[PDB]
Ligand binder design. Structure first.
Ligand SMILES: O=C(O)c1ccc2nsnc2c1
Ligand SMILES: O=C(O)c1ccc2nsnc2c1
Lengths: 289, 275
């Protein structure tokens, strides 16, 4: 065990260090909560930390790691926002006791060798033109769960397809961890919080409200059935200046090889300039809404 | 409430949640959980894995028996009983794959080589079920035979690459009196094939002793012995480093062979020390 100073923020970069501290904590009965992040932390992340914190006897581990394997070549990786000074200040403000900030060399000492192969859901939606993306995400989340061995792991619903694939990973590999999905945190106008919102100029920021407006409109229209819901969202997106829709799809909650029944998820992805935004919402169809 | 566990008797569990609960409860009581994965049809080679697991102080031995569709019950169970194994884990296919084949493990490029030649997806299946069994049973140590050497290397890659907290223990191949590596396939060999099959081990041990004269003398001694046998179709005979990369100029390596006798595919491998 490296030093662990309770009541303050302990930062570990070595996987063996956080693994040893985590195990020692669990053996003294603390329940270890993991919040995996890519840093550039905002209130949507602090909502995950806060949910983890309110679990009785919890110690919270927040990982910060910009995982190269979920990024495609073509500039995305070098462009991802890195603000580590701010990130650690926020965690200290929140009373988090452990930040895990591994190096690429420590995570990938053998490059890409054994990896996770997701099911067919990973080839759709965000995965369509980024066919290796979710293999990257599931591989890193598997390693983070094995290093930290948390009791529960916390993800935002904003990246809903990712949350679903993570539940698949946990079920399919019999992982002994509870996956907690936490509702999206939104700006006062409805804009889903995201580290990539910083890339919208004032006009794009004004226009971006159309995603959440479209989704909320669709959720209320849905008393009138699926067609109405989808046509309401499309009309709102169509009225928004310079919002370029990539997909808008209504699916079952598990996103899967089941037809939509009464409860669904409506998902949108759109480009504003170069910035791609995602959002989604729970939908109840007809009698159900 | 934890399922029933009776110390000193064979406790059989078919439900993954049950063996998980019992393994967790036992480890908290000061036992060290040892896992021996098998596909049943047990022979002396499997009992040597059991015996290695049993000698760890505080051990409780978990033997899984599961025919992995992706890669006699009573008799197997009696053998485990006679060895004093306290837990057998006998899941159905449905209990292991309740959502079918969905998230799986993709091995590194080693899985494309050697055995991965005729069976390109074989090792994805083995690594997937191995990862699952490790997560269900969460053993301190997991035991595999050296006879499936490439499999063992790939397991060790799985464990390192996914940061798994288990010790992988490789146990030397158990052999018949004439050196033939034990395998349930040996029983299909007719008398002429069984007599010729001894060339695999004879070639390898000849090479291991010829290796004081260097790598080419070792390979040439092994080929000469295989060349002296009738009806032995050699699929490969390769000298690699101990992690199955390229053999270095000297130092430790491993020599692997595979051959077909009739319809039966046999494999064998041995440590080699170059010069
Ligand atoms: O930073 C996040 O929003 C985030 C969201 C999902 C993640 N999966 S692994 N690391 C992740 C980080
Ligand atoms: O029965 C065996 O010889 C055997 C050998 C290796 C295995 N990896 S998973 N299940 C396995 C079973």
């Amino acid at each position: 065990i490296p030093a662990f100073h309770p009541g303050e923020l302990n930062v570990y970069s070595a996987p063996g260090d956080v693994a040893d501290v985590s195990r020692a904590l669990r053996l003294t009965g603390r329940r270890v909560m993991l919040v995996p992040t890519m840093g550039a932390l905002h209130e949507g992340h602090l909502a995950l930390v806060r949910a983890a914190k309110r679990v009785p006897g919890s110690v919270v581990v927040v990982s910060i790691f910009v995982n190269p394997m979920q990024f495609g070549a073509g500039g995305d990786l070098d462009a991802y926002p890195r603000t580590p000074d701010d990130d650690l200040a926020q965690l200290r403000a929140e009373g988090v006791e452990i930040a895990f900030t591994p190096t690429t060399a420590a995570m990938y000492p053998d490059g890409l060798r054994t990896t996770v192969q997701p099911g067919p859901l990973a080839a759709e939606l965000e995965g369509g033109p980024r066919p290796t993306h979710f293999a990257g995400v599931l591989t890193v989340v598997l390693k983070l769960l094995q290093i930290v061995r948390p009791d529960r792991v916390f993800f935002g619903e904003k990246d809903y397809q990712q949350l679903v694939l993570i539940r698949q990973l946990v079920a399919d590999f019999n992982l002994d961890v509870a996956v907690v999905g936490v509702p999206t945190v939104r700006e006062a106008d409805g804009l889903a919080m995201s580290s990539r919102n910083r890339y919208l100029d004032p006009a794009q920021r004004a226009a971006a409200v159309a995603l959440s407006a479209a989704l909320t409109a669709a959720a209320h229209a849905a008393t009138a059935g699926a067609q109405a819901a989808l046509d309401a969202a499309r009309a709102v997106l169509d009225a928004a200046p310079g919002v370029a829709v990539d997909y808008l799809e209504l699916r079952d909650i598990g996103l899967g090889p089941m037809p939509l029944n009464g409860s669904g998820r409506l998902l949108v992805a759109a480009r504003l300039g170069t910035t791609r935004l995602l959002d989604n919402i729970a939908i109840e169809i007809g009698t159900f809404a």
